């Protein structure tokens, strides 16, 4: 970067929104994958859309990469800039607008997270529920394609975006579905707004996005159930499903990675184990939790270690059992895997993957969103290029059995710099070349994070 273009960008955002230094660049390199790449050029935070607007604009036509940055949390190196360019840090757009409790939904900035709408939201008997554990930005959630734990019964970001307000590559305004809307349903036209979703900032800049609001639940209960062996867990989870019990929460955790829960929080049994909740009136839940304990039983499950002090921690450990994983070895890194296949392929791919952790000399542990057929193995590295390349054909090895199955390599955390092969694989040449087709008439110049997704 040129220092015209630094004085240029200045001009837009005001001089302390504009950084060139190392420290301040290689602090927004990365997020929290174990990929690195060159830091960027620059890092610029808008202080509003319009200058959003200018500043993509001015990297647009003067050849310069433009990579959104929301709260760095990513787990596939989205934010990573590989060809250089401008980091665009969103998050001091922070402010809830449009909050509309009677149509459920609410109008939310790049800086607000999860946490902040919730809070803003005590006493509406309102609240959002897509909740991956860490603390991040509502519209990176958006981005990336997000999901979580309450997912299995209140749905992913994708079922939950109703609206996005997107700076496309060359700085023109988009409303997805247009200015100001909302509503539960529309056939009008093609439907831009889950084109956005999960684009990861390659197709533009999401600077608003319109949430659905969900009631707050009447009553709710949470509990774990301890299970002999992986095998029982799943097909516990798997049964439950095909039931139609309406759980709102069902986590799976292996020994390992219960193990390292109680260590980081928690004193469960070291067992395979299923966190649940459930939500209804005192009259529904009590009827949701005979059904649910009659199958766990079945399955050898323990009687239900029920757990608003303690489920809060609960779910925090749970929130946190990526902090939780990376303590089990101080100074290590990791990776996470996230495929997703059909719930009656999930028995044989979950237990074939604690059976490959347990072959190889990795150290993994195994958590996820199993009421979605998905979970994450979180494989550990040394920052040793041997073990890398283990962990590497690991992940690579599972997404293929995923694909095997008709799964999808990532359920929740996108693609980023590590599944674009896997992508290819997924989708075919005709589904690569309708991607790219999409991608370069929004992105001709091909500025819009480079690298990433395709
Ligand atoms: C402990 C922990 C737990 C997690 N749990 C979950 C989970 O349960 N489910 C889940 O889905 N993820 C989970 N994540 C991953 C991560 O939190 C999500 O992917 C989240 O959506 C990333 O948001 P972010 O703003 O931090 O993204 P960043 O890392 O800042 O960016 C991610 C990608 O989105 C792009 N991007 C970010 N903001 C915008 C924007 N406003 N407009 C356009 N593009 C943008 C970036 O360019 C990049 O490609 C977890 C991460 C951690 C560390
Ligand atoms: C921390 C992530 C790598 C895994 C995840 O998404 C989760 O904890 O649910
Ligand atoms: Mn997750």
Request: hydrophobic letters at 20%.
């Given at each position: 970067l040129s220092q015209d273009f630094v004085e240029a960008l200045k001009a837009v955002v005001?001089?302390?929104?504009?950084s060139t230094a190392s420290a301040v660049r290689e602090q927004h390199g990365?997020?929290?994958?174990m990929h690195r790449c060159q830091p960027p050029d620059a890092v610029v935070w808008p202080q509003n859309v319009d200058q959003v607007s200018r500043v993509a604009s001015l990297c647009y036509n003067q050849g310069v990469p433009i990579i959104p940055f929301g709260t760095?949390?990513?787990?596939?190196?989205?934010?990573?800039?590989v060809q250089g360019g401008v980091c665009i840090?969103?998050?001091?757009?922070?402010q809830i607008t449009e909050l509309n409790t009677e149509d459920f939904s609410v109008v939310v900035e790049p800086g607000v997270t999860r946490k902040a709408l919730n809070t803003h939201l005590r006493d509406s008997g309102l609240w959002f529920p897509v909740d991956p554990g860490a603390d991040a930005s509502l519209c990176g959630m958006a981005a990336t394609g997000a999901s979580g734990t309450?997912?299995?019964?209140?749905?992913?970001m994708r079922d939950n975006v109703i609206n996005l307000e997107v700076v496309l590559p060359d700085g023109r305004l988009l409303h997805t579905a247009g200015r100001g809307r909302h509503y539960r349903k529309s056939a009008a036209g093609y439907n831009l707004t889950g084109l956005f979703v999960g684009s990861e900032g390659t197709l533009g800049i999401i600077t608003s996005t319109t949430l659905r609001l969900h009631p707050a639940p009447e009553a709710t209960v949470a509990a774990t159930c301890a299970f002999p062996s992986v095998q029982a867990a799943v097909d516990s989870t798997v049964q439950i499903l095909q039931a139609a019990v309406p759980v709102a929460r069902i986590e799976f955790l292996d020994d390992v990675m219960m193990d390292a829960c109680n260590r980081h929080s928690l004193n469960c049994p070291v067992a395979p184990t299923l966190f649940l909740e459930f939500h209804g009136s005192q009259q529904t839940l009590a009827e949701q939790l005979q059904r649910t304990e009659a199958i766990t039983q079945d399955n050898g499950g323990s009687h239900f270690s029920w757990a608003a002090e303690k489920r809060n921690e609960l779910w925090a450990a749970r929130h946190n059992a990526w902090y939780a994983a990376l303590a089990l070895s101080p100074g290590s890194k990791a990776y996470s895997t996230d495929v997703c296949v059909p719930i009656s392929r999930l028995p044989e791919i979950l237990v074939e993957t604690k059976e490959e952790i347990k072959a190889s000399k990795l150290t993994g542990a195994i958590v996820g969103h199993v009421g979605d057929g998905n979970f994450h193995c979180i494989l550990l590295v040394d920052p040793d290029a041997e073990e890398q390349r283990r962990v590497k054909a690991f992940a690579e090895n599972l997404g293929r059995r995923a694909l095997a199955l008709?799964?999808?390599?990532?359920?929740?955390?996108?693609?980023?710099?590590?599944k674009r092969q896997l992508l290819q694989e997924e989708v075919g040449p005709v589904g690569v070349e309708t991607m790219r087709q999409l991608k370069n008439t929004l992105d001709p110049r091909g500025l819009m994070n480079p690298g990433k997704v395709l």
């Open positions: 005001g001089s302390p929104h504009v990365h997020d929290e994958s760095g949390t990513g787990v596939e190196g989205g934010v990573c800039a840090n969103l998050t001091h757009m922070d309450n997912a299995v019964r209140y749905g992913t008709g799964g999808t390599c990532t359920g929740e955390h996108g693609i980023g710099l590590g």
